[PDB]
Coordinates of C-alpha atoms in Angstrom, one line a residue:
Chain T
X831 CA 0.2 0.0 0.0
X832 CA 1.0 3.9 -0.3
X833 CA -0.2 4.2 3.0
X834 CA 2.4 1.8 4.4
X835 CA 5.7 2.3 6.4
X836 CA 6.9 -0.4 3.7
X837 CA 6.1 1.6 0.9
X838 CA 7.6 4.4 2.7
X839 CA 10.6 2.7 3.7
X840 CA 12.1 1.5 0.1
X841 CA 10.8 4.9 -1.6
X842 CA 13.5 6.8 0.7
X843 CA 16.2 5.1 0.2
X844 CA 16.8 5.8 -3.2
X845 CA 16.4 9.5 -2.5
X846 CA 18.7 9.4 0.0
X847 CA 21.7 7.7 -0.8
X848 CA 21.4 7.2 -4.8
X849 CA 21.6 10.3 -6.9
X850 CA 18.9 11.9 -8.0
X851 CA 20.1 12.7 -11.2
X852 CA 18.9 15.7 -13.4
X853 CA 18.2 15.3 -17.2
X854 CA 21.2 17.6 -18.2
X855 CA 25.2 18.0 -17.2
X856 CA 26.2 21.0 -15.9
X857 CA 29.2 23.5 -16.5
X858 CA 31.7 22.8 -13.1
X859 CA 31.3 19.2 -11.6
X860 CA 31.1 21.0 -8.2
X861 CA 27.9 22.8 -9.8
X862 CA 27.3 18.9 -10.7
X863 CA 27.5 17.4 -7.2
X864 CA 26.1 20.6 -5.0
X865 CA 22.8 20.5 -6.8
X866 CA 22.6 16.8 -7.0
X867 CA 22.5 16.3 -2.9
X868 CA 19.8 19.5 -3.1
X869 CA 17.6 18.1 -5.6
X870 CA 17.9 15.0 -3.5
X871 CA 16.7 17.2 -0.4
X872 CA 14.2 19.0 -2.4
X873 CA 12.2 16.1 -3.0
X874 CA 12.6 14.9 0.5
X875 CA 11.6 18.2 2.4
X876 CA 8.2 18.1 0.2
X877 CA 7.6 14.4 1.4
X878 CA 7.8 14.5 4.4
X879 CA 5.2 17.4 4.6
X880 CA 2.9 15.1 2.3
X881 CA 2.9 12.1 5.3
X882 CA 2.8 14.2 8.2
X883 CA -0.3 16.1 6.0
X884 CA -3.1 14.7 7.8
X885 CA -1.7 15.2 11.6
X886 CA -1.0 18.7 10.9
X887 CA -4.7 19.3 8.9
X888 CA -6.6 17.9 11.5
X889 CA -4.9 20.2 14.2
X890 CA -5.6 22.6 11.2
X891 CA -9.5 21.9 11.5
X892 CA -9.4 21.7 15.5
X893 CA -8.0 25.3 15.6
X894 CA -10.5 27.9 15.4
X895 CA -7.7 30.2 16.3
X896 CA -6.4 32.2 13.1
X897 CA -3.0 32.9 14.4
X898 CA -3.0 29.4 15.6
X899 CA -3.8 27.7 12.2
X900 CA -1.3 30.2 10.9
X901 CA 1.5 28.7 12.7
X902 CA 0.3 24.9 11.7
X903 CA 0.7 25.7 8.3
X904 CA 4.3 26.2 8.8
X905 CA 5.2 23.1 9.7
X906 CA 4.1 22.0 6.1
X907 CA 5.3 23.8 3.1
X908 CA 1.8 25.3 2.9
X909 CA 3.8 28.7 3.4
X910 CA 1.4 30.2 0.4
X911 CA -1.7 29.9 2.2
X912 CA 0.0 30.9 5.8
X913 CA 0.1 34.5 4.5
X914 CA -3.2 34.3 2.8
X915 CA -5.2 33.5 6.2
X916 CA -3.0 36.0 8.0
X917 CA -3.9 39.3 5.7
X918 CA -7.4 38.2 6.0
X919 CA -7.6 38.0 9.6
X920 CA -6.5 41.4 10.1
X921 CA -3.1 40.5 11.1
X922 CA 0.5 42.2 9.6
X923 CA 3.0 40.9 12.0
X924 CA 2.3 37.1 10.5
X925 CA 2.7 37.8 7.2
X926 CA 6.0 39.7 7.7
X927 CA 7.8 36.8 9.0
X928 CA 5.8 34.3 6.9
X929 CA 7.0 36.2 3.7
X930 CA 10.9 34.7 5.1
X931 CA 10.4 31.7 5.1
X932 CA 12.1 29.1 2.3
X933 CA 15.8 30.9 3.7
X934 CA 18.2 31.3 6.0
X935 CA 21.1 34.0 6.3
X936 CA 23.6 35.1 9.0
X937 CA 21.1 38.5 8.8
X938 CA 18.2 36.5 9.6
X939 CA 20.3 34.4 12.6
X940 CA 21.0 38.5 13.9
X941 CA 17.2 39.1 13.7
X942 CA 16.2 36.3 15.4
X943 CA 18.4 37.1 18.4
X944 CA 18.5 40.9 18.7
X945 CA 14.5 40.8 18.1
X946 CA 14.4 38.8 21.3
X947 CA 16.7 40.6 23.1
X948 CA 14.9 43.9 22.9
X949 CA 11.7 42.0 23.2
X950 CA 12.5 40.5 26.7
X951 CA 14.3 43.4 27.9
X952 CA 13.1 46.8 26.9
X953 CA 9.5 45.0 26.7
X954 CA 7.5 43.4 29.4
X955 CA 8.7 39.9 27.2
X956 CA 7.2 38.0 24.0
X957 CA 4.7 35.0 24.2
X958 CA 6.8 31.4 25.3
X959 CA 6.0 29.9 21.5
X960 CA 7.2 33.2 19.7
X961 CA 10.4 33.1 21.8
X962 CA 10.6 29.2 20.7
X963 CA 10.5 31.1 16.9
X964 CA 13.4 32.8 17.7
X965 CA 15.4 30.1 18.6
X966 CA 14.1 27.8 15.9
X967 CA 15.9 30.8 13.7
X968 CA 18.9 31.5 15.4
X969 CA 20.0 28.1 14.7
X970 CA 19.6 25.8 18.1
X971 CA 15.6 25.5 19.2
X972 CA 15.9 22.7 21.3
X973 CA 18.5 23.8 22.9
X974 CA 17.8 27.0 22.6
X975 CA 16.8 29.4 25.5
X976 CA 13.3 28.3 25.1
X977 CA 13.1 24.3 24.0
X978 CA 11.1 22.6 21.4
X979 CA 11.8 19.6 23.0
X980 CA 8.6 19.8 24.7
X981 CA 7.0 19.7 21.0
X982 CA 7.4 16.1 20.4
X983 CA 4.9 15.5 23.0
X984 CA 2.2 16.8 20.1
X985 CA 3.8 16.5 16.9
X986 CA 6.3 13.0 15.7
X987 CA 9.9 12.7 15.5
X988 CA 9.9 13.7 11.6
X989 CA 8.1 16.5 12.1
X990 CA 10.9 17.7 14.2
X991 CA 13.6 16.9 12.4
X992 CA 11.4 18.3 9.0
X993 CA 12.1 21.9 11.2
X994 CA 15.8 22.0 11.2
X995 CA 15.6 20.1 7.7
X996 CA 13.7 23.2 5.8
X997 CA 14.8 26.2 7.7
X998 CA 18.0 25.7 10.2
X999 CA 21.6 25.2 8.5
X1000 CA 20.4 24.9 4.9
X1001 CA 23.2 26.2 3.0
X1002 CA 25.8 26.4 5.8
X1003 CA 25.5 23.2 5.7
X1004 CA 25.4 20.0 3.4
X1005 CA 22.3 17.4 3.1
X1006 CA 24.4 15.0 5.2
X1007 CA 25.4 17.1 8.0
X1008 CA 22.2 19.3 8.1
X1009 CA 20.1 15.8 9.3
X1010 CA 23.6 15.4 11.8
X1011 CA 23.2 18.8 13.4
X1012 CA 19.0 18.0 14.5
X1013 CA 20.2 14.5 16.2
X1014 CA 23.0 16.5 18.3
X1015 CA 19.8 18.7 19.3
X1016 CA 17.6 16.2 19.8
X1017 CA 17.6 12.6 18.9
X1018 CA 14.9 10.2 17.0
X1019 CA 13.4 7.3 18.6
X1020 CA 15.1 4.3 18.1
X1021 CA 12.2 1.9 17.7
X1022 CA 11.2 3.3 14.1
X1023 CA 12.5 1.3 11.3
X1024 CA 12.3 4.1 8.6
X1025 CA 13.7 6.8 11.2
Chain G
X1 CA 19.9 80.2 -12.4
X2 CA 21.0 83.7 -12.5
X3 CA 23.2 85.8 -9.7
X4 CA 24.0 88.4 -11.9
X5 CA 25.0 88.3 -15.8
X6 CA 28.8 87.7 -14.5
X7 CA 27.9 84.2 -13.0
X8 CA 26.2 83.2 -16.3
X9 CA 29.3 84.1 -18.3
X10 CA 31.4 81.8 -16.6
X11 CA 29.3 78.6 -17.1
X12 CA 29.9 78.8 -20.8
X13 CA 33.7 78.9 -20.3
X14 CA 33.8 75.8 -18.5
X15 CA 31.8 73.7 -20.8
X16 CA 33.3 75.1 -24.1
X17 CA 36.8 73.9 -23.1
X18 CA 35.5 70.4 -22.4
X19 CA 33.6 70.1 -26.1
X20 CA 37.0 71.1 -28.2
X21 CA 39.2 68.9 -26.6
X22 CA 36.6 66.1 -27.1
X23 CA 36.4 66.8 -30.6
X24 CA 39.7 66.9 -31.5
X25 CA 40.4 63.1 -29.9
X26 CA 37.2 61.7 -31.6
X27 CA 38.6 62.4 -35.1
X28 CA 42.1 61.0 -34.5
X29 CA 42.8 57.3 -33.6
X30 CA 46.0 58.1 -32.0
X31 CA 44.1 59.6 -29.6
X32 CA 41.3 58.0 -27.4
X33 CA 38.2 58.0 -29.8
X34 CA 36.2 57.9 -27.0
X35 CA 37.8 60.0 -23.5
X36 CA 36.0 59.7 -20.4
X37 CA 38.7 61.3 -18.0
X38 CA 38.0 65.0 -18.7
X39 CA 34.1 64.7 -18.6
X40 CA 34.7 63.3 -15.2
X41 CA 37.2 66.0 -14.1
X42 CA 34.2 68.8 -15.7
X43 CA 31.7 66.7 -13.6
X44 CA 33.7 66.7 -10.2
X45 CA 34.3 70.8 -10.7
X46 CA 30.7 71.2 -11.4
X47 CA 29.5 69.0 -8.5
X48 CA 31.7 70.6 -6.1
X49 CA 31.5 74.4 -6.7
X50 CA 27.3 73.9 -6.2
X51 CA 27.7 72.1 -3.3
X52 CA 30.1 74.8 -1.5
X53 CA 27.9 77.7 -2.9
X54 CA 24.4 76.5 -1.1
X55 CA 26.1 75.3 2.4
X56 CA 27.8 79.2 2.4
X57 CA 24.0 80.5 3.1
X58 CA 23.4 83.2 1.0
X59 CA 20.2 83.8 -0.7
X60 CA 22.5 84.7 -4.0
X61 CA 24.6 81.8 -3.7
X62 CA 21.6 79.4 -3.7
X63 CA 19.9 80.3 -7.0
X64 CA 23.5 80.0 -8.6
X65 CA 23.6 76.9 -6.8
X66 CA 20.8 75.4 -9.0
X67 CA 22.6 75.9 -12.0
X68 CA 25.9 73.9 -10.7
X69 CA 23.9 71.4 -9.7
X70 CA 22.3 70.6 -13.5
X71 CA 25.6 71.0 -15.6
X72 CA 27.3 68.2 -13.3
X73 CA 24.2 65.7 -14.0
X74 CA 24.9 66.5 -17.9
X75 CA 28.4 65.5 -17.9
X76 CA 27.3 62.1 -16.1
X77 CA 24.2 61.5 -18.5
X78 CA 26.6 61.7 -21.2
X79 CA 29.1 59.0 -19.5
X80 CA 26.5 56.2 -19.0
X81 CA 25.9 56.1 -22.6
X82 CA 29.4 56.4 -24.3
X83 CA 30.6 53.6 -22.1
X84 CA 27.5 51.3 -24.2
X85 CA 28.7 52.6 -27.5
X86 CA 32.3 52.2 -26.7
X87 CA 31.7 48.6 -25.1
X88 CA 28.6 46.6 -25.1
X89 CA 28.6 43.8 -22.5
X90 CA 27.6 40.2 -23.2
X91 CA 28.8 38.8 -20.2
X92 CA 27.5 35.8 -18.2
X93 CA 27.2 33.2 -20.2
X94 CA 26.1 30.9 -17.8
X95 CA 24.0 27.9 -17.3
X96 CA 20.3 27.8 -18.5
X97 CA 19.4 24.1 -17.9
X98 CA 16.0 23.9 -15.9
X99 CA 17.3 23.4 -12.4
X100 CA 20.2 25.6 -11.2
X101 CA 20.3 28.6 -8.9
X102 CA 17.5 31.7 -8.9
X103 CA 21.0 33.8 -8.8
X104 CA 22.9 32.1 -11.2
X105 CA 20.0 32.3 -14.0
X106 CA 19.8 36.4 -12.8
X107 CA 23.4 37.4 -13.5
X108 CA 23.1 35.4 -16.8
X109 CA 20.3 37.2 -18.1
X110 CA 20.8 40.9 -17.1
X111 CA 23.9 40.5 -19.0
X112 CA 23.1 38.8 -22.2
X113 CA 20.3 40.7 -22.8
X114 CA 21.3 43.7 -24.0
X115 CA 17.6 45.8 -23.3
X116 CA 18.1 44.5 -19.6
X117 CA 21.6 46.1 -19.4
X118 CA 20.0 49.5 -21.1
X119 CA 17.6 49.6 -18.3
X120 CA 19.9 48.8 -15.8
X121 CA 22.2 51.8 -17.0
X122 CA 19.0 54.1 -16.9
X123 CA 18.4 53.2 -13.7
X124 CA 22.1 53.7 -12.4
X125 CA 21.3 57.6 -13.3
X126 CA 18.2 57.6 -11.5
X127 CA 19.2 56.0 -8.0
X128 CA 22.2 58.7 -7.5
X129 CA 19.8 61.9 -8.0
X130 CA 17.4 60.6 -5.6
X131 CA 17.6 62.5 -2.6
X132 CA 18.6 61.9 1.3
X133 CA 17.6 63.6 4.2
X134 CA 19.4 64.1 7.4
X135 CA 20.3 61.0 10.2
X136 CA 17.7 60.9 12.7
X137 CA 17.2 62.0 16.1
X138 CA 16.4 59.0 17.6
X139 CA 17.8 55.4 18.1
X140 CA 15.5 53.7 20.6
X141 CA 16.5 50.5 22.5
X142 CA 12.9 50.2 23.4
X143 CA 10.0 50.9 21.3
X144 CA 6.8 51.6 22.6
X145 CA 8.5 52.2 26.0
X146 CA 5.6 54.4 27.5
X147 CA 3.0 51.7 26.6
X148 CA 5.3 48.8 27.7
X149 CA 5.1 50.8 30.9
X150 CA 1.5 50.6 31.4
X151 CA 1.4 47.0 29.5
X152 CA -0.8 47.6 27.1
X153 CA 1.8 46.1 25.0
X154 CA 3.4 42.5 25.7
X155 CA 6.8 43.9 24.7
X156 CA 8.5 45.8 21.8
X157 CA 6.5 44.5 19.3
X158 CA 4.8 45.3 16.1
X159 CA 2.0 42.8 17.0
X160 CA -0.5 46.0 18.4
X161 CA 0.4 48.0 15.5
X162 CA -0.4 45.5 12.9
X163 CA -3.9 44.2 14.6
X164 CA -4.8 48.0 16.2
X165 CA -7.4 49.9 13.6
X166 CA -6.0 53.4 14.2
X167 CA -2.7 52.3 14.8
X168 CA -1.7 52.7 18.6
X169 CA 0.7 55.6 18.5
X170 CA 1.2 58.2 21.7
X171 CA 1.6 62.0 21.4
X172 CA 5.3 60.8 21.7
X173 CA 5.5 58.3 19.2
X174 CA 4.3 60.0 16.3
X175 CA 7.1 62.5 17.0
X176 CA 9.5 59.2 16.8
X177 CA 8.2 58.1 13.7
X178 CA 7.9 60.8 11.6
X179 CA 11.5 61.8 11.2
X180 CA 13.0 57.9 11.4
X181 CA 10.3 56.6 8.9
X182 CA 10.8 59.1 6.3
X183 CA 14.8 58.5 6.4
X184 CA 14.4 54.6 6.2
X185 CA 12.0 55.1 3.2
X186 CA 14.0 57.5 1.6
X187 CA 17.4 55.4 2.7
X188 CA 15.1 52.5 0.8
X189 CA 14.6 54.3 -2.6
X190 CA 19.1 54.9 -2.6
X191 CA 19.7 51.6 -1.1
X192 CA 22.7 50.6 0.6
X193 CA 21.9 47.3 2.5
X194 CA 25.0 47.1 4.4
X195 CA 24.7 50.7 6.1
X196 CA 20.8 49.8 6.9
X197 CA 21.5 46.5 8.7
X198 CA 23.8 48.5 11.1
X199 CA 21.0 51.1 12.0
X200 CA 18.3 49.0 12.2
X201 CA 19.5 46.7 15.1
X202 CA 20.4 50.0 17.4
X203 CA 17.0 51.5 16.5
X204 CA 14.9 48.5 17.4
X205 CA 13.5 48.5 14.3
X206 CA 15.5 45.3 12.8
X207 CA 12.9 44.1 11.0
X208 CA 12.8 46.7 8.0
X209 CA 16.6 46.2 6.5
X210 CA 15.8 42.6 6.1
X211 CA 12.9 43.4 4.0
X212 CA 15.5 45.2 1.9
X213 CA 18.2 42.6 1.8
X214 CA 15.3 39.9 0.6
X215 CA 15.8 41.1 -3.3
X216 CA 19.1 39.1 -3.0
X217 CA 19.6 36.0 -4.1
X218 CA 22.5 32.9 -3.6
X219 CA 26.0 34.0 -3.9
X220 CA 26.9 30.9 -2.0
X221 CA 30.0 29.2 -3.4
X222 CA 28.7 25.8 -2.0
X223 CA 25.3 25.9 -4.4
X224 CA 27.0 26.9 -7.6
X225 CA 30.6 28.1 -8.4
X226 CA 29.0 30.4 -11.1
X227 CA 27.8 32.4 -8.1
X228 CA 31.2 31.7 -6.0
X229 CA 32.4 34.7 -8.5
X230 CA 30.1 37.3 -6.6
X231 CA 30.8 37.3 -2.5
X232 CA 31.3 33.9 -0.6
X233 CA 28.2 33.6 1.0
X234 CA 24.0 33.6 -0.1
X235 CA 21.8 36.1 0.7
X236 CA 18.0 37.6 0.7
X237 CA 15.2 35.3 0.2
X238 CA 14.7 32.3 -2.4
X239 CA 11.0 32.9 -2.6
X240 CA 11.1 36.6 -4.3
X241 CA 7.6 36.0 -5.9
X242 CA 6.0 35.0 -2.3
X243 CA 7.8 37.8 -0.7
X244 CA 6.7 40.5 -3.5
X245 CA 2.9 39.6 -3.4
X246 CA 2.6 39.1 0.4
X247 CA 4.5 41.9 0.9
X248 CA 2.2 44.1 -1.3
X249 CA -1.2 42.6 0.3
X250 CA 0.7 43.6 3.9
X251 CA 0.8 47.3 2.2
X252 CA -2.7 47.3 1.1
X253 CA -3.6 47.0 5.3
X254 CA -5.2 49.8 7.5
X255 CA -4.3 50.5 10.7
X256 CA -0.8 51.3 9.7
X257 CA 0.5 54.9 9.2
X258 CA 0.7 56.2 5.9
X259 CA 4.5 55.5 5.8
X260 CA 4.4 52.0 7.1
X261 CA 2.2 50.9 3.7
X262 CA 4.4 53.0 1.9
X263 CA 7.8 51.3 3.0
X264 CA 6.2 48.0 2.2
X265 CA 4.6 49.0 -1.3
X266 CA 8.2 49.6 -2.2
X267 CA 9.4 46.5 -1.1
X268 CA 6.5 44.7 -2.8
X269 CA 7.5 46.4 -6.0
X270 CA 4.8 48.8 -6.0
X271 CA 4.4 53.1 -6.4
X272 CA 4.0 54.3 -2.8
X273 CA 0.7 55.8 -1.9
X274 CA -0.2 59.1 -2.5
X275 CA 0.1 61.0 0.7
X276 CA 3.7 60.2 1.0
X277 CA 4.9 60.0 -2.7
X278 CA 4.7 64.0 -3.2
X279 CA 7.5 65.1 -0.7
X280 CA 9.6 62.3 -3.5
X281 CA 11.2 63.9 -6.6
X282 CA 10.3 63.0 -10.2
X283 CA 13.4 60.8 -10.8
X284 CA 12.4 57.9 -8.2
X285 CA 8.9 57.8 -9.4
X286 CA 9.7 57.1 -12.8
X287 CA 12.4 55.0 -11.5
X288 CA 9.9 52.6 -9.6
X289 CA 7.9 51.7 -12.8
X290 CA 11.7 50.9 -14.6
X291 CA 12.0 48.5 -11.7
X292 CA 8.6 46.3 -12.6
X293 CA 9.6 46.0 -16.5
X294 CA 13.3 45.2 -15.2
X295 CA 11.8 42.0 -12.7
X296 CA 8.8 40.9 -14.7
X297 CA 11.4 40.1 -17.9
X298 CA 13.7 38.4 -15.2
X299 CA 10.8 35.9 -13.7
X300 CA 9.6 35.1 -17.3
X301 CA 12.9 33.6 -17.7
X302 CA 12.8 32.1 -14.3
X303 CA 9.4 30.2 -15.1
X304 CA 10.7 28.5 -18.0
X305 CA 13.5 27.2 -15.1
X306 CA 10.8 25.8 -13.3
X307 CA 11.9 28.0 -10.3
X308 CA 9.3 31.0 -10.0
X309 CA 5.8 30.2 -9.1
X310 CA 2.5 31.3 -9.9
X311 CA 0.5 30.1 -6.6
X312 CA 2.9 32.7 -4.9
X313 CA 0.8 35.6 -5.9
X314 CA -0.9 36.9 -2.9
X315 CA -2.4 39.9 -3.9
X316 CA -1.3 40.9 -7.2
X317 CA 1.3 43.5 -7.7
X318 CA 0.4 46.6 -9.5
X319 CA 1.3 46.6 -13.2
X320 CA 3.7 49.3 -14.2
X321 CA 4.7 50.5 -18.2
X322 CA 3.6 54.2 -17.9
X323 CA 5.2 56.4 -20.2
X324 CA 7.3 59.2 -19.7
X325 CA 4.2 61.1 -20.4
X326 CA 2.4 59.9 -18.3
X327 CA 4.9 59.9 -15.6
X328 CA 5.1 64.1 -15.8
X329 CA 1.4 64.0 -15.8
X330 CA 1.1 62.1 -12.2
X331 CA 4.0 64.2 -10.8
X332 CA 2.4 67.5 -11.7
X333 CA -0.6 66.6 -9.9
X334 CA 1.2 66.4 -6.8
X335 CA 3.7 69.4 -7.4
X336 CA 3.8 71.1 -10.8
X337 CA 7.3 71.7 -10.2
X338 CA 9.3 69.3 -11.3
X339 CA 7.2 68.3 -14.5
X340 CA 5.9 71.8 -15.5
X341 CA 9.6 73.4 -15.2
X342 CA 11.4 73.7 -18.9
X343 CA 15.1 72.3 -17.7
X344 CA 13.4 68.7 -16.5
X345 CA 11.3 68.7 -19.6
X346 CA 14.4 68.8 -21.7
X347 CA 15.4 65.5 -19.6
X348 CA 12.4 63.7 -20.1
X349 CA 12.3 64.1 -23.7
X350 CA 15.7 62.2 -24.0
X351 CA 13.9 59.1 -22.8
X352 CA 10.4 59.1 -24.4
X353 CA 12.5 60.1 -27.6
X354 CA 11.1 62.9 -29.0
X355 CA 13.8 65.7 -28.3
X356 CA 14.5 66.4 -32.0
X357 CA 10.7 67.2 -32.5
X358 CA 10.5 69.1 -29.6
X359 CA 13.6 71.1 -30.3
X360 CA 12.3 71.9 -33.5
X361 CA 9.4 74.1 -32.3
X362 CA 11.9 76.1 -30.0
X363 CA 14.2 76.3 -33.3
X364 CA 11.6 78.3 -35.5
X365 CA 11.2 80.6 -32.4
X366 CA 15.0 81.3 -32.4
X367 CA 16.3 81.8 -35.8
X368 CA 13.5 84.8 -35.4
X369 CA 15.7 86.4 -32.5
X370 CA 19.0 86.1 -35.0
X371 CA 16.9 88.1 -37.4
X372 CA 16.1 90.5 -34.9
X373 CA 12.3 89.9 -35.0
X374 CA 11.8 88.6 -31.6
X375 CA 13.1 89.8 -28.3
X376 CA 9.7 88.8 -25.7
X377 CA 10.1 85.0 -26.1
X378 CA 10.1 83.3 -22.4
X379 CA 13.9 81.5 -23.9
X380 CA 15.3 85.1 -24.4
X381 CA 13.6 86.5 -20.7
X382 CA 16.1 82.6 -19.6
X383 CA 19.4 83.2 -21.0
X384 CA 20.4 80.0 -18.8
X385 CA 17.7 77.7 -20.7
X386 CA 19.1 78.9 -24.4
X387 CA 22.7 77.6 -22.8
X388 CA 21.2 74.5 -21.7
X389 CA 19.5 73.4 -25.0
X390 CA 22.4 74.2 -27.1
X391 CA 25.2 72.4 -25.0
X392 CA 22.6 69.4 -24.7
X393 CA 22.3 68.9 -28.4
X394 CA 26.2 69.5 -29.4
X395 CA 27.7 66.4 -26.6
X396 CA 25.5 63.9 -28.3
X397 CA 26.5 65.0 -31.6
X398 CA 30.1 64.6 -31.4
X399 CA 30.6 61.2 -32.7
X400 CA 27.3 61.4 -34.5
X401 CA 23.5 62.3 -33.3
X402 CA 22.2 59.9 -30.0
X403 CA 19.0 62.1 -29.8
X404 CA 19.3 65.1 -31.6
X405 CA 19.3 65.8 -35.0
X406 CA 22.3 67.9 -36.6
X407 CA 19.7 70.4 -38.5
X408 CA 18.6 71.6 -35.2
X409 CA 21.5 71.5 -33.3
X410 CA 23.6 73.9 -35.8
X411 CA 20.2 75.9 -35.4
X412 CA 20.5 76.3 -31.6
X413 CA 23.9 77.3 -32.3
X414 CA 23.5 80.1 -34.3
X415 CA 20.8 81.7 -32.0
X416 CA 23.6 80.8 -29.2
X417 CA 26.4 82.4 -31.0
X418 CA 24.1 85.6 -31.4
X419 CA 23.3 85.5 -27.8
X420 CA 27.1 85.3 -27.0
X421 CA 28.1 88.7 -28.5
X422 CA 25.1 90.4 -26.3
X423 CA 26.7 89.2 -23.1
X424 CA 30.3 90.3 -24.2
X425 CA 31.9 86.7 -24.8
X426 CA 33.2 86.3 -28.4
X427 CA 36.1 83.8 -27.2
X428 CA 33.2 81.0 -27.0
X429 CA 32.1 81.8 -30.0
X430 CA 34.7 80.2 -32.3
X431 CA 34.8 76.6 -30.6
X432 CA 30.7 76.5 -31.0
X433 CA 30.8 78.1 -34.7
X434 CA 32.8 74.7 -36.2
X435 CA 29.8 72.5 -35.7
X436 CA 27.6 74.5 -38.0

């Protein structure tokens, strides 16, 4: 079946370890090879989102708060539509941060650490989960000052893995080292065959 | 403009020397056919003397100040165009397979396509000539501190100003906003991501600079090695299409200040809202529509490489393909002063491409002045206006005509020689007489 973990196990392995080649040949072999790994990664990231799908969707349905639905979308690749709900619900603040999804930079890290410090010092302090997001963007959510390790307790080890894999340390890392970094911040359960 | 007839003559002498020298070089191949060093020196002189006179603060030195500022620009305009005729670029012969970086495609397209290099060049002229006010008088390290103190805000957060109907301000906070938000917007039209990143951090207004940086793309060697030759680290947001359309939707939200929406409108690639746009000059307004053109071409190619997406369009952008003529008309309704002032009109017609035709009507009146059958026109009541139009025409026709026919150019000179007798200069005349 295509709902089964058996389907998932054979399918995943070709993407991971074997190249997923291009229809052409690049000008330089470090463009050859770089793009080859990035290709594997691209496909993976969307696939994970489809599997985790129904789960996230369920929670979106059961949440009748605009803001909360907006967060739930970002654990997919529903970036598009996350923005769409935010405008409609009269929330500017959520749209601005959503436009930045799909990229990470030294600049973006800088935003994340400073905005948090100014807020929890000059302010009276931002909410628990907003300060958790700052930790995901600075590049250590689980070892971050607000820890997301509690989020295992609501969302599967594969979703947790998803977070670091799409946003944190994407182009400061190769596809190999990137999954490893997540393990050093939070190990996946051992009883998973596919994990 | 004029100080006194004494100040008017001297402008003629600087210009005349530059023109003769250039003419000799162009007709020898033992000398640089197209020289760029002299016009630059002439440029650097007009420019510096402009600024010194303004800063002195006397009324007589400002009026004269305008005339120097115009002069230095004419030299610059001529420079970019002759760089093109004396060397077209055709760089960035990078890949074109449909799977590579947004940035590898962006460089490759811009340099190959002669049409996009010509739009880029024009924009380089416009950007410079956009005005930036003086430095802000505030660098707050807690924003909204007075409402923080009462605790109606959870923090220094902008959640509340993006949720609030009327936009949560205090009297003190409006006084902070106006100086600050006006400088960041002006700064944005004139760029510099590095400068922006450094300031925003101190003024607890960190987010806006990052929005300005999102235009950027990969410049990482790790990703591709053709974009290893421009930075060693990637930059910006690699979902550009999504960022434009969402920011645009955000721009239209109310319970923002006019500035908040205006800032976002520019960052999303729309013309700013009318309240705010009226304090900016003609040049920058025009410039924004040239942005729309340039990026639409880039994204069409991005679409064939199956990168850019149609789903990322959130609230559509307002398309721009307005002419120079429509642009004069919009600017003129907000302030008729840069689009009903004659010099800025001469500049426009270069762009729209009707300068010989517009010159011709003027040229008929002018020949009469020579014949001494006119002496009550507004170009003989403006000595400076005759001087500008003639010199404009000569410079572009040194190699051969680039926007003004020879006939007209000669005819402007004939009248200008007629005037130069009247101002008591007869040494500049034998220079101009050769081009007839």
